[PDB]
DNA sequence: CAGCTCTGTACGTGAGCGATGGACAGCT
DNA sequence: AGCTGTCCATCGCTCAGTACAGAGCTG
């Protein structure tokens, strides 16, 4: 990474970009390599966030990680991830890790307590799920899920994790149908607050 | 048995590497 | 005309969670 060490990377951790006020929350499942040499949120080349973001109309212009700072006060958006740790990939974590990563989790999300608590990944909110609702459903599904985080009003809402790594949504016109969604009930919840 | 949990395998695109070699121009 | 080096187009290749079978568990 222009001479910059693997070893040096992994030691490297990727700020929140959070604040009160927020209509929705971005959790990512941990950085890898790229996001840690940056210090942006998803610079993957071919990680599909941005294009997604552009792509569903949650941005209005085609963004990328040098303006994840500006998406609070411009759009409503902010981030965080499950687990601090900088791997190269999301199976180098331990068990213990991903449950330290929730129950700082659910304190970070009880805080800033946004409309939306969006799960980049299926396998975070598997984990989320049985750790702080104590749900283990067989059949857990993208979308809204029906347990908001305790002790507040924020809803919890699965997407596909917009890593290219997944065969079964191989590109960003594949997982855009659940950032349509997730912009559909973001309005519909400043619509009930409205009226 | 029947429903779980746990573990290992298999899987589609597209961005961007290093390697390769074709086009081309400067110079003799 | 022949030589040679740069540039760049192009190629092969790598690589950034999810789903599900089946072994194991246990009520």
Same mark, same amino acid.
């Given at each position: 990474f222009n001479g910059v060490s693997e070893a040096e990377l992994l030691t490297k951790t990727l700020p929140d970009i959070l604040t009160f006020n927020l209509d929705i929350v971005i959790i990512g499942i941990n950085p890898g390599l790229m996001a840690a040499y940056k210090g942006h949120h998803y !610079? =993957? !080349? =071919?990680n599909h966030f941005w294009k997604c973001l552009f792509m569903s109309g949650l941005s209005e212009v085609q963004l990328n990680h040098m303006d994840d700072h500006t998406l609070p006060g411009k759009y409503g &958006? $902010? +981030? @965080?991830?499950?687990?601090?740790? @900088? @791997? !190269? $990939?999301?199976?180098? *974590?331990?068990?213990?890790? +991903?449950?330290? #990563? #929730?129950? &700082? *989790?659910?304190?970070?999300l009880q805080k800033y307590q946004p409309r939306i608590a969006v799960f980049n990944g299926k396998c975070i909110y598997e984990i989320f799920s049985k750790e702080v609702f104590g749900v283990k459903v067989k059949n857990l599904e +993208? $979308? *809204?899920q029906p347990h908001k985080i305790p002790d507040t009003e924020t809803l919890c809402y699965v997407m596909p994790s917009s890593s290219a790594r997944c065969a079964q949504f191989p590109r960003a016109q594949d997982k855009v149908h659940y950032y349509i969604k997730l912009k559909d009930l973001r309005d519909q919840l400043k619509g009930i607050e409205r009226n």
């Open positions: !610079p =993957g !080349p =071919g &958006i $902010g +981030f @965080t991830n499950m687990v601090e740790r @900088t @791997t !190269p $990939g999301s199976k180098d *974590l331990s068990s213990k890790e +991903f449950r330290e #990563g #929730g129950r &700082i *989790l659910v304190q970070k +993208f $979308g *809204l």
